[PDB]
């Protein structure tokens, strides 16, 4: 019945336009009004803009007041959202649902859409840095130890990290990367290995990353 | 007269969609409720 | 305005009964309407309550919403199901939402986090740059708190948290990275990583050399 579908996202560098647009099935479109309403990767929901049923009623918040602007056309049952000289804090997915009144003072939502992916950055491939987490002062709890290798400003994923040669896999721990405010990858990668060879042995580890043909050899 | 009077009844006359109880409100261009909903009834040995 | 305040999140196990609410920082809670909202992880969100307690066609009752003065806040009572039915949940009442909380089923007895925290090595300090590591393992459900303080108070610029993701053993890693740079790791005495695994905290101090 109530079936919404969104369309017009895409990589877009800061500084650029971008256009929305949201078509919308099976109920009348003539008497419901609809919200724009857009989450935060881990952090919550925030409303952005409302139409009214007809027209008029144009709601907006603080930050998004006068960058965006919000339009629907009743004959052809669509959305449009125009939005231009964007920032990097607004890059996330944007949602196009409709309310349950007919206007939008009600703040009401129902059967929303499936969302989009718009993001603004600088992306950039960049050659990784790896730099050796070291271990503590030949304190232990169970004879193990506790170091591994960082690798930081790399994009895009993903990256290959391995030790000695890829001899080594029992207690190798690698996490997902982290996206940073500058929009690059990072991550670490441990090695659970008993104290005994601290002093000793030493660890070598090797880092992959093919976009930007990088291939490291970092010792701990 | 009120000033802002006749505009009043403008934006009373032609925003209407409030979705209540009854339905569907709208009012036409000279006053009285448009599309209500209708019960048809027969009489039937003094019944209805 | 006011914010709305929620717990992070809460679990328990199949067949028992428990209350969600969140509470009304500044104003009367009942002066307006508030509404709860479910969203199962990776799809987009649906109407589960909304005008305080009323239930939405298709809603298999057994949902229920507590608006009681109390303390400034609204609750949910809901009964003892679990199934499928656990992800995050929001409240919202006027342009604002909550802060997020999920239900887990509980599935493996839970376990203490393990934390590692690594300073900054001496040659990221000699590139004007420091990273600190706290990496969290081995903890259940994937719901932690991850805190950095300056020995004094908490600090919160450049801080970077990792979402955490199932393991193989089915259960969750975490890693977060503190970004500063040596004038300011060498300036103060020592920084605390502070984890929280549903109330359960754990505090790891480093210090320079």
């Known amino acids: 019945?109530?079936?919404?579908?969104?369309?017009?996202?895409?990589?877009?560098?800061?500084?650029?336009?971008?256009?929305?647009?949201?078509?919308?099935?099976?109920?009348?479109?003539?008497?419901?009004?609809?919200?724009?309403?857009?989450?935060?990767?881990?952090?919550?929901?925030?409303?952005?803009?409302?139409?009214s049923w007809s027209s008029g009623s144009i709601g907006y918040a603080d930050s998004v007041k006068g960058r965006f602007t919000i339009s629907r056309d009743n004959a052809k049952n669509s959305l449009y959202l125009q939005m231009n000289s964007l920032r990097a804090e607004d890059t996330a997915?944007?949602?196009?649902?409709?309310?349950?009144?007919?206007?939008?003072?009600?703040?009401?939502?129902?059967?929303?859409?499936?969302?989009?992916?718009?993001?603004?950055?600088?992306?950039?491939?960049?050659?990784?840095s790896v730099f050796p987490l070291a271990p503590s002062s030949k304190s232990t709890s169970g004879g193990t130890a506790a170091l591994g290798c960082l690798v930081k400003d790399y994009f895009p994923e993903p990256v290959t990290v391995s030790w000695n040669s890829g001899a080594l896999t029992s207690g190798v721990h690698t996490f997902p990367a982290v996206l940073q405010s500058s929009g690059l990858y990072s991550l670490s990668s441990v090695v659970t290995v008993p104290s005994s060879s601290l002093g000793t042995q030493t660890y070598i580890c090797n880092v992959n990353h093919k976009p930007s043909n990088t291939k490291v050899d970092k010792k701990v | 007269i009120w000033k802002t009077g006749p505009l009043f009844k403008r934006v009373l006359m032609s925003s209407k969609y409030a979705d209540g109880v009854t339905g569907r409100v709208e009012f036409?261009?000279?006053?009285?409720?448009?599309?209500?909903?209708?019960?048809?009834?027969?009489?039937?040995?003094?019944?209805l | 305005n006011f914010m709305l305040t929620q717990p992070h999140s809460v679990s328990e196990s199949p067949g028992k009964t428990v209350t969600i609410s969140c509470t009304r920082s500044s104003g009367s809670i009942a002066s307006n309407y508030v509404q709860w909202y479910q969203q199962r992880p990776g799809s987009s969100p649906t109407t589960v309550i909304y005008d305080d307690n009323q239930r939405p066609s298709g809603v298999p009752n057994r949902f229920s919403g507590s608006i009681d003065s109390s303390s400034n806040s609204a609750s949910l009572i809901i009964s003892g199901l679990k199934t499928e039915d656990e992800a995050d949940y929001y409240c919202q009442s006027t342009r604002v939402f909550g802060g997020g909380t999920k239900l887990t089923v509980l599935g493996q007895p839970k376990a203490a986090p393990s934390v590692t925290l690594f300073p900054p090595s001496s040659e990221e300090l000699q590139a004007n740059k420091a990273t600190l590591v706290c990496l969290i393992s081995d903890f259940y459900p994937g719901a932690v708190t991850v805190a950095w303080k300056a020995d004094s108070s908490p600090v919160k610029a450049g801080v970077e948290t990792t979402t955490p993701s199932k393991q193989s053993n089915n259960k969750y890693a975490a890693s977060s990275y503190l970004s500063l740079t040596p004038e300011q790791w060498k300036s103060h005495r020592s920084y605390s990583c502070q984890v929280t695994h549903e109330g359960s905290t754990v505090e790891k101090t480093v210090a320079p050399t």
């Not at chain 1, 309310?99 to 600088?122: N, P």
Request: charged share 20%.
């Open chain 1, 93 to 128: 997915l944007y949602y196009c649902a409709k309310d349950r009144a007919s206007s939008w003072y009600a703040y009401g939502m129902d059967v929303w859409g499936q969302g989009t992916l718009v993001t603004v950055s600088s992306a950039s491939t960049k050659g990784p």
């Open chain 1, 1 to 51: 019945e109530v079936q919404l579908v969104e369309s017009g996202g895409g990589l877009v560098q800061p500084g650029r336009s971008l256009r929305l647009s949201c078509a919308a099935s099976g109920f009348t479109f003539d008497d419901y009004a609809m919200h724009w309403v857009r989450q935060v990767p881990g952090k919550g929901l925030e409303w952005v803009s409302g139409i």
């Open chain 2, 28 to 47: 036409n261009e000279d006053g009285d409720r448009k599309f209500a909903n209708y019960s048809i009834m027969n009489l039937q040995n003094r019944k």
